[PDB]
Design a protein around this nucleic acid. Sequence first.
RNA 1: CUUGAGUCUCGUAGAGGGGGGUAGAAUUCCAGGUGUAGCGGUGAAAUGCGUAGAGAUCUGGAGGAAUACCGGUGGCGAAGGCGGCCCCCUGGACGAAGACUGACGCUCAGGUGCGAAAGCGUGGGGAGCAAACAGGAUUAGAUACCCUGGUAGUCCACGCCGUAAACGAUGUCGACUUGGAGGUUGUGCCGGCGUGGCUUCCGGAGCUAACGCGUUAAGUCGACCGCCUGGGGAGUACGGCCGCAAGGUUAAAACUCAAAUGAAUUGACGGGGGCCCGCACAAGCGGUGGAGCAUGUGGUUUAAUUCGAUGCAACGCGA
Lengths: 66, 153, 70, 117
Amino acid sequence: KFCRFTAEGVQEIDYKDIATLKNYITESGKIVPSRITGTRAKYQRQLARAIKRARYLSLLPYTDRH
Amino acid sequence: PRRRVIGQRKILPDPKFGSELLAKFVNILMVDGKKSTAESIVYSALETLAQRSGKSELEAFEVALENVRPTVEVKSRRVGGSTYQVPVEVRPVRRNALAMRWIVEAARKRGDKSMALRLANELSDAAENKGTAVKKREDVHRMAEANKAFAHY
Amino acid sequence: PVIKVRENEPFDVALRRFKRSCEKAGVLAEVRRREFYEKPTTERKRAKASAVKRHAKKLARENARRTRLY
Amino acid sequence: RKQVSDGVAHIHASFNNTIVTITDRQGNALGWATAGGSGFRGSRKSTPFAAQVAAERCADAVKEYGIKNLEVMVKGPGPGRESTIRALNAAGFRITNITDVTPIPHXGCRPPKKRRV
RNA sequence: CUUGAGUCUCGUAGAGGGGGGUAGAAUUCCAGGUGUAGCGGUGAAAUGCGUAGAGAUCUGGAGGAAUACCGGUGGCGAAGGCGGCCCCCUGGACGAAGACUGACGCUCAGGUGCGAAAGCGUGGGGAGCAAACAGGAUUAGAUACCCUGGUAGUCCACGCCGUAAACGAUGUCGACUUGGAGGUUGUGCCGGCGUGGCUUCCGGAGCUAACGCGUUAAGUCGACCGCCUGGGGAGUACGGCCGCAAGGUUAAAACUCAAAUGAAUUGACGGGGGCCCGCACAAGCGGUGGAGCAUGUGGUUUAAUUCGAUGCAACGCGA
Ligand SMILES: [Mg+2]
Ligand SMILES: [Mg+2]
Ligand SMILES: [Mg+2]
Ligand SMILES: [Mg+2]
Ligand SMILES: [Mg+2]
Ligand SMILES: [Mg+2]
Ligand SMILES: [Mg+2]
Ligand SMILES: [Mg+2]
Ligand SMILES: [Mg+2]
Ligand SMILES: [Mg+2]
Ligand SMILES: [Mg+2]
Ligand SMILES: [Mg+2]
Ligand SMILES: [Mg+2]
Ligand SMILES: [Mg+2]
Ligand SMILES: [Mg+2]
Ligand SMILES: [Mg+2]
Ligand SMILES: [Mg+2]
Ligand SMILES: [Mg+2]
């Protein structure tokens, strides 16, 4: 668990922070359920938005088979 | 059965050679509780077989058995209206039992005059992969091989 | 589930690694899910029933831990 | 003829069949075998054993190319996913990579209607 | 007058709505490369596809539709509904401090608006799916379920239709009345303690025919509206209104029955589930069914062929 973003006082998740976002995607590129990472729901939604934005900018892959 | 209390019955070895396997063979040949008749037939056939092969009675019998003993057979299993012939291993006691049953059945359909002569001929033929007992073993093996895919059932 | 066979790794071990990668990514479950169309009403009914059964089972377990069988 | 020594094994493992195509790394087919073409029909066609035999036969079909190393791409939910790879390994190929390439729509098209059996 | 109702200030979450753009995955099709005898499908098949080179695999292209994961008895909306990402326009909700207006409120026949899916009109679009339709199976038949194909339609714009088990089968608004465990979204103070909004499950009194409901009431009350009056005939006929139509809406009667119905209870049953057992299967051995004959029965015959037993549980049975 240990939702990191509340303990870091973030106001957003920042789609440009690929280091943080790689901790929330599986090796195939899928977004990890918050019931596994322990993320709070609000920050899970922020995280999903950020990952989708990063995927659009090709900073993250959609899958591992591009 | 459902409960499983079922265990070997004690089998007396045959008087001449002291072979439990041969005693089972005599039992398989016997009709109507006429054990002495079956014993006479088996001893006559074994003597003829040893004269023809020069090996011995028990060794010629074993050599005939080895060519008829199956290693794999099929057990039917219904799945979707179709029955799946699932190949299973044959445990050793059943291999001997099936081989002796097939040999006796083959010898009973032969054309020779006395049953002792028919049995000696069948044992000789099986000693070199020729009789219908060996043919039945081959058919069982080939039916099991044709179903090798369905080995998990 | 891309898997690279590492050096001096027996084949069975790497096959197991690939199998676990596939079972983790849920590829077979996804394929089976997508074989046929399920109406949204059926999907919602299935999800609701699964949640209800999970909750009822959990409560039964919690209240059976207070129960002596003998 | 041409010697390749580095190939890809594509295992199309459907519910009814298994197709094994061995290609070079550029995607050109060198030889193929299927469970359905290896003396298995109907119920026997869609088994791990028929897939194993298809894998053996496809490995035989590419002996002339001198292939030594194989990438393995598995596609589909069929019973021939694993036994095909085991048979390719027992055929003497050095399997250097196993990948699942099963197509997953990210929504995609509406699937056919549910069967009522 | 300020306590109900409302305005303002600052923030918060949200698949709320309308418009535009765009991304990646996948299907299909087209062109080509490699390659060669099958593919596909089912319970099993066959139709179908394939040596005129399919299926598989690689490359490039076209096009439509939907947005995996996140995703959650999570969220938003009056309901219907709403899900990738980005922008533009826009509605509501909530919280904290105040300030402001000063009963401006609640409900609502008629009226008006919105209103899933299917359907209808005009013009587009059409990948996938698929009523109709065709063929292949299955079957006694099989106008089906299964298979191979496949057109409306599903998609877009605009208009119509106005109905759904449109459901919480529970009208709206307000007040009051023990608890427990969560979810979500604010906010105050020091992970703890409060305090708001929405929400899931359990349960107390009470209520209820019972099942159950239970501070989100089906409890205790007040305001207003809608609706019911045995089953069938019938939400039908006729008339009116509405609709392009399909039809919707309003809505009878004759006649007929002595029931129809709700919930719960004990069985029985199930091609429901679980656990067991039996020469019940399975593994075996020997038979019956064919022949002749014995014997009983049915039937036929007869003057009479005495009466009885006559699925298992009558038929070498009373005898
Ligand atoms: Mg299908
Ligand atoms: Mg009205
Ligand atoms: Mg429509
Ligand atoms: Mg139209
Ligand atoms: Mg079409
Ligand atoms: Mg069809
Ligand atoms: Mg209605
Ligand atoms: Mg609804
Ligand atoms: Mg509902
Ligand atoms: Mg109603
Ligand atoms: Mg309750
Ligand atoms: Mg009417
Ligand atoms: Mg039996
Ligand atoms: Mg007879
Ligand atoms: Mg009589
Ligand atoms: Mg009588
Ligand atoms: Mg009587
Ligand atoms: Mg008797």
